[PDB]
Amino acid sequence: GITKPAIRRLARRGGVKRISGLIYEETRGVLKVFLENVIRDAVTYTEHAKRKTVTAMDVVYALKRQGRTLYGFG
Amino acid sequence: LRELLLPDTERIRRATEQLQIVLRAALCDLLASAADPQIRQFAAVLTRRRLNTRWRRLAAEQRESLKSLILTALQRETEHCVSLSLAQLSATIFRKEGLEAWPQLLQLLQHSTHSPHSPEREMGLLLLSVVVTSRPEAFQPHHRELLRLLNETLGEVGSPGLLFYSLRTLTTMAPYLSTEDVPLARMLVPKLIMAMQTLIPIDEAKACEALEALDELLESEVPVITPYLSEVLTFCLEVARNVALGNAIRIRILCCLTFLVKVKSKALLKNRLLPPLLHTLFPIVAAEPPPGQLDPEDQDSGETPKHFAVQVVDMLALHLPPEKLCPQLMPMLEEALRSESPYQRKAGLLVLAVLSDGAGDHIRQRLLPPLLQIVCKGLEDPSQVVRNAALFALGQFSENLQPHISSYSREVMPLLLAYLKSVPLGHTHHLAKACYALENFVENLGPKVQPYLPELMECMLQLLRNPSSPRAKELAVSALGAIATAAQASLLPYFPAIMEHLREFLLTGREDLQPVQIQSLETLGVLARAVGEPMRPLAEECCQLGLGLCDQVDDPDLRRCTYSLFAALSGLMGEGLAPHLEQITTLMLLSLRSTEGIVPQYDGSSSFLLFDDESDGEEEEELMDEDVEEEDDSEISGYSVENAFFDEKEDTCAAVGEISVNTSVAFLPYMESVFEEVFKLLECPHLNVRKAAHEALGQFCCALHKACQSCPSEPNTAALQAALARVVPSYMQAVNRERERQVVMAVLEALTGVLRSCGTLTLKPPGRLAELCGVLKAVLQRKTACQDTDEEEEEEDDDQAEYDAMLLEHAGEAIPALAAAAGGDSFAPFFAGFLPLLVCKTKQGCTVAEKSFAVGTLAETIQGLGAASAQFVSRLLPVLLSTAQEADPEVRSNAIFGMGVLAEHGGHPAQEHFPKLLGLLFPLLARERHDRVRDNICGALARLLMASPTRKPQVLAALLHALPLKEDLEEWVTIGRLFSFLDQVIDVAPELLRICSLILADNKIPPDTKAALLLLLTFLAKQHTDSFQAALGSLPVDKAQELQAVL
Amino acid sequence: MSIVSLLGIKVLNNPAKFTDPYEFEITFECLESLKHDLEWKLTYVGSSRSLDHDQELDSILVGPVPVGVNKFVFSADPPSAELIPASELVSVTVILLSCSYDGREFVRVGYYVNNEYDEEELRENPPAKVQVDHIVRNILAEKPRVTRFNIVWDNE
Amino acid sequence: ARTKQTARKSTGGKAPRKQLATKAARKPHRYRPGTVALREIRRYQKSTELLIRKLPFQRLVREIAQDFKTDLRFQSSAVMALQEASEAYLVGLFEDTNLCGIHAKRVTIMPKDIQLARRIRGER
């Protein structure tokens, strides 16, 4: 569900220099698992809100479960 | 070569989905199946994508062989579409490779484009146009060579293909024309006109794609088309008035004329190009529609050139002085009005309506009494078309002639109300027209709507309380919102019913009432803005409803008009938005980055590859930063921008600015998040979005400054300094570099609003004042790029445009704000250079409005400068003295105010003129009849008495003889400060006592004035107290009761 | 906003021996006493292809919660080299240290540890049989990666 | 004081009414922009385009959405938020993978490095 040039550009912004050919399938799987978790939490929030349509607020609330990862201790 | 790539029967799906996809359950090596025509087209289309996806995996061994195969193919093709596809493939190969990495394609282009064979020239120009279009920046060095080639080729009128493709090349190269390349393009322009004239009758589509080149050449920042303006305008008029021609080409030509007028309108005014322009435009406006058919705007239940001709007339009015347009248009218009044909009346009414925009003042003071032309004639015209035109014209009149049209309400309102009553239900189009006119008239009435309030409320509650079509309820809701705007505080008696109707609309979840949901939210916001305290208990409940509809259905017009609702509610709720501030800060930032407005349109060959290369190698292609392996220009058949998302941004920017200004404490954690995106919008290609972003950043600065005042912490002031250092340079860079004039006025207004609020924080970095003053002096000197450098060449000091006066006034309004921020000590050298322009604006014989504005600006700059006006009093005194000798109320009032404040803040160098200054105020006091000017003379006399060196040796008695302060309550502070500056108070006792007695009830009078009197009463209560008994005896006993009340 | 937040992690032995017990110095602050004690877990990731193949070294609990610099000794056995895949034994992997309250994790810090030969002698002629004693592991504590999970502390 | 001339086009007011009910104050739904406007629109869209193409991302989100429950719709803003979150997560994962590769004395990333980055970035 993600095109290969998008994967290459995302790796470029991350500082990756050389990429093996097996990276694409692995990163597609990683994206799929992450989106499955986030959509699961968003749907839980939407059902708690007694609605049949997921909005941006539900996604924002769902993103809070994954936590925050920042460099250092700030 | 058994490749069955053609549709065959309607079972082409049986081919595509089944075959050529089962490779797994080497084709690149022989993708040169040159067997039958347009199968080569399929092959080239597939090969383009295949090579786009896997160019870097072919190394270099077969690169040269493939390039040679493609070049050999390009020299033998006979058709056109497949030749274009091969050119696309060649350009794709060129685009991903280097400029000099393909040294034979350039040789082929150079050899073919100078060949003596017509097919060779056509194939060379087609390939050249495609290659240049693909990578425009590659041909940056050889502008002169490519322009010479284009000039040579465009002279071949025999072959339309060469003309069309050379014009496409010009389209691609036009934006990147440098100053040194101007003579070649100037020489080429007549050839472009000849090519256009040849290509117009052959085909409409090619004519449009070459009008693309003409439009790109119109605005290029270099003087390319100015020397041939007469010829270009003649060609545009010749093609525009061809009634037998198509509508699309005429619309494109009218847009070209609009751009010609906008870029340079003064050039065609000096020459005799305007009368032919009007004589060609007006018949298009009054063009008879096909018999049986009707105009698009007059349908019972954009396309025609009529609207675009009206738009051209509007743009001509905006960018031209009325004194040079009205005398040349009024005869034609007046002849049009008194015509038998109804469409002549329609054209006249439309032209007058759009002339009321850019010529607002000329119509407003001098041509507004002849309002009988619209209301009394077209509104009751036998023809319905004339009635619709009259309604639109009345709406434009009541929306542009804002202050001087409310005086005619007594005679306009009854007929408009009768017209609304006359419209039967089920005619929602006519009702919409009439309601537009009614709302536009009502919004400006203000207090005048109170006599007509019950009738309007009954009329608008007839629709809502009774069964009616959903289209006829949003119109009533909009009219109700306009009435609410008009009657800010007189709407309380009808408030509960209106509120319950709006709540009933909002609560009900029926799917056919979406537009009335939008209008209900909008009118709820309008009510929140207009009516105040009684809505505060119910304001909290409105936030839940606003977000409730914003998360049920996704609509750009629903997310908008909800941000406006919260902006309105933030005014009265205050800091109550904190629980909802997170939810309204998100879902708003996402709207700010929403790119759904630009939706691509794809009309071409369907994609049948649907295959991705599988490899396990170690890819090294990342070394090239600019990867061109992504999908670029996949048969883009143009774009279709939706005009509802940019209108969402223009309003959400203002809403978030207002929310930040109002909620100034709870918005801090989100201010940084919103600021970055609002700044990112500053480069948007949309006029209104840029204006809204520029107006929103200033509100962010004001909100952050007031937050810093709330909590004087180091992080707050550091953030304020960073925000100012990020905004003010953007404001200064967008004034003398941005072409759109509507943005420049908004930027100047925002800069004035920042300098007044932020104050000294703006000018703290060194050297900021030196460039801010330079910018404001460049706007007044017409040196900025937004004014087109006085419309090119020079001027002979003639009457400028009507809409540029507003720009100059906005530029000059920031001088008082700038003076109050620099402290006056450091602003004197810059005011020395600022003075000549303002003096020239107030020179005898100029415009009255400019005179008054210049005098008021001088007075306010004196106020800001303060004690640093000692060296400027000598220059300023003659100007103010001469201005105070005129026969205009506002101008003379401003002159007296400025002279008085100069006396107050002039210091020692202004003291020597005191006897002369007093020798002139006495004659003005008696002769003048207006209440405003005598009050300003009173204030000037008071201030002059304040700046007494030692004592005043009567001015005091004559000043205290009359105190008619009615319309200038802001002078009461000076009047009160006048008292108690330290014996003859017996004679002047009755008038000051009666003034105090009458002003006791009124709260508009500052309390400090009353406190001043008590000091002098008590100070004199001991020495010479016998006179108080005589004063009390002289006063009437009725005033004596109120006198004894205070003790 | 977590009541107890990590400030910094100091490693005393780096590079350390493969069989040398992992020991770390942890600095944190205690605003108020917690009724339940805090437990820390150290886990070693052997194979990255599966999450159920990892091993948890141990779990220890400390009753008192001292304020300031704390004195304590780890009681964890060295990770088992035998259970580590032979192919992936000499390779990079990650170690995770987390503090959990009532079974709810709120801070987790991970470190990259690399299993590489310390001498060119074995690199020149890598034998089929791997020697545990000749592999030296190092921990990149200079650039830690911290993950913070917000949880409820008081009913309020 | 100075007479303020703000009675011109209502500039400086609170906020002009949208007037979108009455023919939006005189094709608004879909219109073709001009050449100079089309070029600038192209420049703006290319300048701010996100790394992940939006159509495949909405298609994938719909795939998982119907995997959970059929007839489950998503707000466009929700899809945009999901796209931005996915881009940020992938960039963080890729930089952690680059660190893992650098620490391993290697310049090429491998799926095992991706898995190690996932494990260190918080499990879940």
Short mmCIF file of N, CA and C in Angstrom, two decimals, chain B residues 6-110:
data_model
loop_
_atom_site.label_atom_id
_atom_site.label_comp_id
_atom_site.label_asym_id
_atom_site.label_seq_id
_atom_site.Cartn_x
_atom_site.Cartn_y
_atom_site.Cartn_z
N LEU B 6 -4.56 -5.29 -28.91
CA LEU B 6 -5.62 -4.39 -29.34
C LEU B 6 -6.97 -4.85 -28.80
N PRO B 7 -7.92 -3.91 -28.65
CA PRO B 7 -9.17 -4.21 -27.93
C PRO B 7 -9.89 -5.49 -28.34
N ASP B 8 -9.86 -5.84 -29.62
CA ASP B 8 -10.66 -6.96 -30.17
C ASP B 8 -12.12 -6.67 -29.85
N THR B 9 -12.85 -7.60 -29.24
CA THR B 9 -14.23 -7.37 -28.84
C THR B 9 -14.28 -6.63 -27.50
N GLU B 10 -15.47 -6.61 -26.91
CA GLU B 10 -15.66 -5.99 -25.60
C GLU B 10 -15.07 -6.85 -24.49
N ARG B 11 -14.37 -7.92 -24.86
CA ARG B 11 -13.67 -8.78 -23.92
C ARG B 11 -12.22 -8.36 -23.72
N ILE B 12 -11.92 -7.07 -23.88
CA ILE B 12 -10.56 -6.57 -23.65
C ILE B 12 -10.14 -6.83 -22.20
N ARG B 13 -11.11 -6.86 -21.29
CA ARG B 13 -10.81 -7.20 -19.90
C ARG B 13 -10.26 -8.62 -19.79
N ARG B 14 -10.84 -9.56 -20.55
CA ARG B 14 -10.35 -10.93 -20.55
C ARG B 14 -8.88 -10.99 -20.95
N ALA B 15 -8.45 -10.04 -21.79
CA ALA B 15 -7.03 -9.94 -22.10
C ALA B 15 -6.25 -9.31 -20.95
N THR B 16 -6.64 -8.10 -20.54
CA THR B 16 -5.82 -7.33 -19.62
C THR B 16 -5.66 -8.03 -18.27
N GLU B 17 -6.76 -8.47 -17.66
CA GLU B 17 -6.68 -9.00 -16.30
C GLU B 17 -6.06 -10.40 -16.27
N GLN B 18 -6.09 -11.12 -17.38
CA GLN B 18 -5.64 -12.51 -17.40
C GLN B 18 -4.26 -12.68 -18.02
N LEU B 19 -4.06 -12.22 -19.25
CA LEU B 19 -2.77 -12.34 -19.91
C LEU B 19 -1.87 -11.17 -19.54
N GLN B 20 -0.59 -11.29 -19.91
CA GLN B 20 0.44 -10.28 -19.63
C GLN B 20 0.49 -9.93 -18.14
N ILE B 21 0.12 -10.88 -17.29
CA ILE B 21 0.19 -10.69 -15.84
C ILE B 21 0.63 -12.00 -15.21
N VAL B 22 0.74 -13.04 -16.03
CA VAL B 22 1.02 -14.40 -15.56
C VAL B 22 2.45 -14.77 -15.92
N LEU B 23 3.34 -13.78 -15.92
CA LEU B 23 4.74 -14.03 -16.28
C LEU B 23 5.39 -15.03 -15.34
N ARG B 24 5.17 -14.90 -14.03
CA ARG B 24 5.77 -15.83 -13.09
C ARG B 24 5.11 -17.20 -13.15
N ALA B 25 3.78 -17.24 -13.22
CA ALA B 25 3.05 -18.50 -13.24
C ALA B 25 2.78 -18.96 -14.67
N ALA B 26 12.31 -10.20 -19.17
CA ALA B 26 13.10 -10.27 -20.39
C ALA B 26 12.38 -9.58 -21.54
N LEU B 27 11.17 -9.09 -21.28
CA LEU B 27 10.40 -8.41 -22.31
C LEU B 27 10.98 -7.04 -22.63
N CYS B 28 11.79 -6.49 -21.72
CA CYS B 28 12.39 -5.17 -21.95
C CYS B 28 13.39 -5.20 -23.09
N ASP B 29 13.95 -6.38 -23.40
CA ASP B 29 15.03 -6.49 -24.36
C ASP B 29 14.59 -6.26 -25.80
N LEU B 30 13.31 -6.42 -26.11
CA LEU B 30 12.83 -6.35 -27.49
C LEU B 30 11.52 -5.58 -27.57
N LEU B 31 11.36 -4.57 -26.70
CA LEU B 31 10.17 -3.72 -26.74
C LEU B 31 10.33 -2.69 -27.85
N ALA B 32 10.42 -3.20 -29.08
CA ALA B 32 10.51 -2.40 -30.30
C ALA B 32 9.64 -3.01 -31.39
N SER B 33 8.42 -3.40 -31.02
CA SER B 33 7.52 -4.12 -31.91
C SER B 33 6.93 -3.15 -32.93
N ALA B 34 7.74 -2.84 -33.95
CA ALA B 34 7.33 -1.92 -35.01
C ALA B 34 6.64 -2.71 -36.13
N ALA B 35 5.37 -3.04 -35.88
CA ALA B 35 4.58 -3.81 -36.83
C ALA B 35 3.41 -3.03 -37.41
N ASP B 36 2.54 -2.50 -36.56
CA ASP B 36 1.34 -1.80 -37.01
C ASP B 36 1.19 -0.50 -36.23
N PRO B 37 0.65 0.55 -36.86
CA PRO B 37 0.54 1.84 -36.18
C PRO B 37 -0.31 1.79 -34.92
N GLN B 38 0.11 2.59 -33.93
CA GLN B 38 -0.54 2.84 -32.65
C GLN B 38 -0.36 1.66 -31.70
N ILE B 39 0.08 0.52 -32.24
CA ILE B 39 0.71 -0.48 -31.39
C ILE B 39 2.08 0.00 -30.95
N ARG B 40 2.76 0.75 -31.81
CA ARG B 40 3.94 1.48 -31.37
C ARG B 40 3.58 2.50 -30.30
N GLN B 41 2.38 3.07 -30.37
CA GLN B 41 1.93 3.98 -29.32
C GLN B 41 1.79 3.25 -27.99
N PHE B 42 1.12 2.09 -27.99
CA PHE B 42 1.08 1.28 -26.77
C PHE B 42 2.48 0.94 -26.28
N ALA B 43 3.36 0.52 -27.19
CA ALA B 43 4.70 0.11 -26.79
C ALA B 43 5.46 1.26 -26.15
N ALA B 44 5.35 2.47 -26.72
CA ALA B 44 6.03 3.62 -26.16
C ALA B 44 5.44 4.02 -24.81
N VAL B 45 4.12 3.94 -24.66
CA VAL B 45 3.51 4.27 -23.37
C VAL B 45 3.99 3.31 -22.29
N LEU B 46 4.01 2.01 -22.59
CA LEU B 46 4.49 1.04 -21.62
C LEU B 46 5.98 1.24 -21.33
N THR B 47 6.77 1.50 -22.37
CA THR B 47 8.21 1.65 -22.20
C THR B 47 8.55 2.88 -21.37
N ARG B 48 7.78 3.96 -21.50
CA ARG B 48 8.03 5.15 -20.70
C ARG B 48 7.99 4.82 -19.21
N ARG B 49 6.91 4.17 -18.77
CA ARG B 49 6.80 3.79 -17.37
C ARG B 49 7.83 2.74 -16.97
N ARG B 50 8.10 1.77 -17.84
CA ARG B 50 9.07 0.73 -17.52
C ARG B 50 10.45 1.33 -17.27
N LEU B 51 10.86 2.26 -18.14
CA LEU B 51 12.15 2.91 -17.98
C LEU B 51 12.14 3.91 -16.82
N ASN B 52 10.99 4.52 -16.54
CA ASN B 52 10.90 5.39 -15.37
C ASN B 52 11.12 4.60 -14.09
N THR B 53 10.58 3.38 -14.02
CA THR B 53 10.73 2.55 -12.84
C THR B 53 12.07 1.84 -12.76
N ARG B 54 12.71 1.51 -13.89
CA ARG B 54 13.94 0.73 -13.83
C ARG B 54 15.04 1.28 -14.74
N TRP B 55 15.27 2.59 -14.76
CA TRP B 55 16.35 3.14 -15.59
C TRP B 55 17.72 2.81 -15.01
N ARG B 56 17.88 3.00 -13.70
CA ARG B 56 19.20 2.86 -13.08
C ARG B 56 19.65 1.41 -12.95
N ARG B 57 18.78 0.44 -13.21
CA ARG B 57 19.15 -0.96 -13.15
C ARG B 57 19.59 -1.52 -14.50
N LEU B 58 19.67 -0.68 -15.53
CA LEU B 58 20.19 -1.08 -16.82
C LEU B 58 21.68 -0.80 -16.97
N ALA B 59 22.33 -0.27 -15.93
CA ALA B 59 23.75 0.07 -15.97
C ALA B 59 24.06 1.01 -17.12
N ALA B 60 25.03 0.64 -17.96
CA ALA B 60 25.39 1.45 -19.12
C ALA B 60 25.61 0.67 -20.40
N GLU B 61 25.66 -0.67 -20.36
CA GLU B 61 25.98 -1.44 -21.55
C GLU B 61 24.92 -1.27 -22.63
N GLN B 62 23.64 -1.37 -22.26
CA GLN B 62 22.55 -1.29 -23.22
C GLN B 62 21.93 0.10 -23.30
N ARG B 63 22.44 1.05 -22.50
CA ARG B 63 21.91 2.41 -22.53
C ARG B 63 22.11 3.05 -23.90
N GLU B 64 23.33 2.98 -24.44
CA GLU B 64 23.61 3.55 -25.75
C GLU B 64 22.84 2.86 -26.86
N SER B 65 22.72 1.53 -26.81
CA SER B 65 21.95 0.83 -27.83
C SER B 65 20.48 1.23 -27.79
N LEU B 66 19.91 1.34 -26.59
CA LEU B 66 18.52 1.77 -26.47
C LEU B 66 18.33 3.20 -26.97
N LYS B 67 19.27 4.09 -26.63
CA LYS B 67 19.19 5.46 -27.11
C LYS B 67 19.26 5.52 -28.63
N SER B 68 20.16 4.73 -29.22
CA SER B 68 20.26 4.69 -30.67
C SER B 68 18.98 4.15 -31.30
N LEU B 69 18.37 3.13 -30.69
CA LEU B 69 17.11 2.60 -31.20
C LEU B 69 16.02 3.67 -31.17
N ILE B 70 15.93 4.41 -30.07
CA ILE B 70 14.91 5.45 -29.96
C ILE B 70 15.15 6.56 -30.98
N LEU B 71 16.40 6.99 -31.15
CA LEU B 71 16.71 8.02 -32.14
C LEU B 71 16.40 7.54 -33.56
N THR B 72 16.72 6.28 -33.86
CA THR B 72 16.38 5.74 -35.17
C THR B 72 14.87 5.71 -35.38
N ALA B 73 14.12 5.34 -34.34
CA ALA B 73 12.66 5.33 -34.44
C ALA B 73 12.11 6.73 -34.67
N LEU B 74 12.67 7.74 -34.00
CA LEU B 74 12.17 9.11 -34.13
C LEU B 74 12.39 9.70 -35.52
N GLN B 75 13.31 9.14 -36.31
CA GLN B 75 13.61 9.67 -37.64
C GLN B 75 12.83 8.98 -38.75
N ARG B 76 11.94 8.04 -38.41
CA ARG B 76 11.19 7.30 -39.41
C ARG B 76 9.69 7.27 -39.16
N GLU B 77 9.23 7.83 -38.04
CA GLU B 77 7.80 7.80 -37.74
C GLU B 77 7.04 8.74 -38.67
N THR B 78 5.83 8.32 -39.05
CA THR B 78 5.00 9.08 -39.98
C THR B 78 3.75 9.67 -39.35
N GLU B 79 3.19 9.04 -38.33
CA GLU B 79 1.98 9.53 -37.69
C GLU B 79 2.34 10.65 -36.70
N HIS B 80 1.35 11.13 -35.96
CA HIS B 80 1.54 12.24 -35.03
C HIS B 80 1.44 11.82 -33.58
N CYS B 81 0.38 11.10 -33.19
CA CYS B 81 0.21 10.72 -31.80
C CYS B 81 1.33 9.81 -31.33
N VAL B 82 1.69 8.82 -32.14
CA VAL B 82 2.80 7.94 -31.78
C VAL B 82 4.12 8.71 -31.80
N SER B 83 4.26 9.68 -32.71
CA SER B 83 5.44 10.53 -32.70
C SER B 83 5.51 11.34 -31.41
N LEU B 84 4.37 11.85 -30.95
CA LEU B 84 4.34 12.56 -29.68
C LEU B 84 4.70 11.64 -28.52
N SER B 85 4.24 10.39 -28.56
CA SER B 85 4.58 9.45 -27.49
C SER B 85 6.07 9.13 -27.49
N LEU B 86 6.66 8.96 -28.67
CA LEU B 86 8.11 8.74 -28.75
C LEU B 86 8.87 9.96 -28.26
N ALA B 87 8.37 11.16 -28.55
CA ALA B 87 8.99 12.37 -28.01
C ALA B 87 8.90 12.40 -26.49
N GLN B 88 7.76 11.96 -25.94
CA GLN B 88 7.62 11.87 -24.49
C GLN B 88 8.63 10.90 -23.89
N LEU B 89 8.81 9.75 -24.54
CA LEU B 89 9.80 8.78 -24.08
C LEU B 89 11.21 9.36 -24.14
N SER B 90 11.54 10.06 -25.23
CA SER B 90 12.86 10.66 -25.36
C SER B 90 13.08 11.71 -24.28
N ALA B 91 12.06 12.52 -23.99
CA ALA B 91 12.18 13.52 -22.93
C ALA B 91 12.35 12.86 -21.57
N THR B 92 11.62 11.77 -21.32
CA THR B 92 11.76 11.05 -20.06
C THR B 92 13.18 10.51 -19.90
N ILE B 93 13.76 9.98 -20.98
CA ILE B 93 15.15 9.55 -20.92
C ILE B 93 16.07 10.73 -20.65
N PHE B 94 15.81 11.86 -21.32
CA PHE B 94 16.63 13.05 -21.11
C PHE B 94 16.47 13.61 -19.70
N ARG B 95 15.24 13.59 -19.17
CA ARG B 95 14.98 14.22 -17.88
C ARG B 95 15.76 13.54 -16.76
N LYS B 96 15.78 12.21 -16.74
CA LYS B 96 16.44 11.48 -15.67
C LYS B 96 17.96 11.49 -15.80
N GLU B 97 18.48 11.72 -17.00
CA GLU B 97 19.92 11.76 -17.23
C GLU B 97 20.41 13.21 -17.16
N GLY B 98 21.72 13.39 -17.31
CA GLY B 98 22.29 14.72 -17.28
C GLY B 98 22.06 15.49 -18.57
N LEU B 99 22.35 16.79 -18.50
CA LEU B 99 22.18 17.66 -19.66
C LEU B 99 23.15 17.28 -20.78
N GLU B 100 24.42 17.09 -20.44
CA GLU B 100 25.44 16.75 -21.42
C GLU B 100 25.68 15.25 -21.53
N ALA B 101 24.95 14.43 -20.78
CA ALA B 101 25.11 12.98 -20.84
C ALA B 101 24.49 12.37 -22.09
N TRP B 102 23.74 13.16 -22.87
CA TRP B 102 23.10 12.70 -24.10
C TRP B 102 23.51 13.65 -25.21
N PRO B 103 24.74 13.53 -25.72
CA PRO B 103 25.26 14.52 -26.66
C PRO B 103 24.76 14.37 -28.09
N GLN B 104 23.93 13.37 -28.39
CA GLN B 104 23.39 13.19 -29.72
C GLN B 104 21.97 13.72 -29.88
N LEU B 105 21.18 13.75 -28.81
CA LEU B 105 19.85 14.34 -28.89
C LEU B 105 19.93 15.83 -29.21
N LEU B 106 20.86 16.54 -28.56
CA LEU B 106 21.05 17.96 -28.85
C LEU B 106 21.51 18.17 -30.29
N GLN B 107 22.40 17.31 -30.77
CA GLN B 107 22.85 17.41 -32.16
C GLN B 107 21.70 17.18 -33.13
N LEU B 108 20.85 16.18 -32.84
CA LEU B 108 19.69 15.94 -33.69
C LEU B 108 18.76 17.14 -33.69
N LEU B 109 18.51 17.73 -32.52
CA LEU B 109 17.63 18.90 -32.46
C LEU B 109 18.21 20.05 -33.26
N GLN B 110 19.50 20.33 -33.09
CA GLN B 110 20.12 21.45 -33.80
C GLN B 110 20.11 21.22 -35.30
#
